[PDB]
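Researcher: Go.
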Amino acid sequence: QLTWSQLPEVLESGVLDTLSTEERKRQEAIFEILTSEFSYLHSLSILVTEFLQSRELRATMTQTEHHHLFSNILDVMSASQKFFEALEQRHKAQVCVEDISDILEDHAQHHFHPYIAYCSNEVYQQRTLQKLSNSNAAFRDVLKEIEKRPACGGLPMISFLILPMQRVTRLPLLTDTLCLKTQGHPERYKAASQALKAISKLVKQCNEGAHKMERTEQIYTLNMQLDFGKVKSLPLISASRWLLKRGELFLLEESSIFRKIASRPTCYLFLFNDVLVVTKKKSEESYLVQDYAQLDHVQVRKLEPSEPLSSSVPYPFQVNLLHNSEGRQEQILLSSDSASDRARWITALTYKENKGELPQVEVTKAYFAKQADEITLQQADIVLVLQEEDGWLHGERLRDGETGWFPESFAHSITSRVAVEGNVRRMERLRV
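Model: Structure:
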C-alpha cells in the first residue's frame, strides 16, 4: 500500500523537497522490485509450509508424484530468499538506494538456475495434479482441508505452484522500468542495462526448457498413441517435431446432399509443425492413422455454403494433400461447428506460409491455454493482434513473442498512439 515516497523514513529525511522527479521514480522502481519479491517469497513459504511439508498430503501420493508435483520448489524459495535479503540490505542502509543492478545481474547470472528446472518441469506438475485430482480420493480430501486453512488466504494450491513462472517473467518488466528511470545516470544505466540482458536471458532459457520438455513428452506420448499399422510407416519421433493443433472434425462427403446431424462421421487431426496426420479415434489412448502428408504439401480453403433458391455443415473447409502417404493426391472435406474453430484450423494449416502497425490489446484477466494453439496470458500482458475471428484473437505477446489464440473477452484495445508507440519501443528493449 505505501509507496517509497510515503515511507516514514523518507518523509523524515526531507529528501523529497529537492529530489528530482526522475530520481523519485527511480527509487520507486527499486522499491517495487523489493516489495514484489517479498510478497512472492511470502507466498512461496505458504506453499512450502502448508503443501510441500504436509505429511498427510504426502501419504496420499508416492515419492515420484511428490517430486513431480513440487519439483525443486525449495531451491526456488532459497534463491528468492537470498535475492530478497540482498535487496533488503540496500533498502535498510540508505533513504535513497544508489543502485541494485549489480544484485539483479549477479543473481540472474549465478543464482537463478533453479528457475530453469522448475519452469521446465511444468508439464509433469500439470499431469501429476490432473491424475491426483481425477483418480485419488484421499488426495482430494486432504487437499480440500488444507485449502480451508487461513494461511492460504483463499487461494488453491495450483495458484501457488505457478508463482515462480509468473515471477520470473515479470522481472524483465520491472528491470526495464528501472533502466528507464536510470537514464539520467550514465554508469548506472549501463549496469541496469546489463541487468536487463541477464534477466532476459534467464527467462529465455526458462521458456526454452519448458517448451523442450513439453514437446518431448508429447512426441513420445503421441508416437505411442498413433497407430500407423494400415499406412506406410512414418517415424513420428524427432527432436524438432512439435504439435501445432489437434482435434476432432466432422467428415463431409459431397456425394450426400441429405446430411444428418446424428451419427455424423468424424476424423481426428494431429497437425505438427512439419506434418499433418489424419486419424480415426479408437480410444482416448489410441488413434488409427488413415493418411498423412508433409505440411509443405498441404493446401486448405474454406468451402462455400449451398446456393440459395440451417446447414448440417455449419463452417466447412477442405484440406488437399498434394502428396499423401502413398505419394498420391487426396482431398478431405471437413466441418467444424464454430467459425473460430475453422479459422484456428486454417491458421494452423498455413503455419508454413510491420509490427508497429499491428493493433495492440491489453489483457484484463489471466487466461490459461486449454489447447496447443492457445497462449497462456497474465493480467496486463500486451498482445499484438494478428487475427480476429468470432470472439477469438490470434496474437503475439509483446514481452517474449509467444503466439496463440485467446478469447477476445479477456483483453481490451489500446487506442492511444503514444502508448502504442511506447509499447513497440519496449518490445526491442525486451527481446533477445
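Model: The first strand starts at residue 226 and ends at 227.
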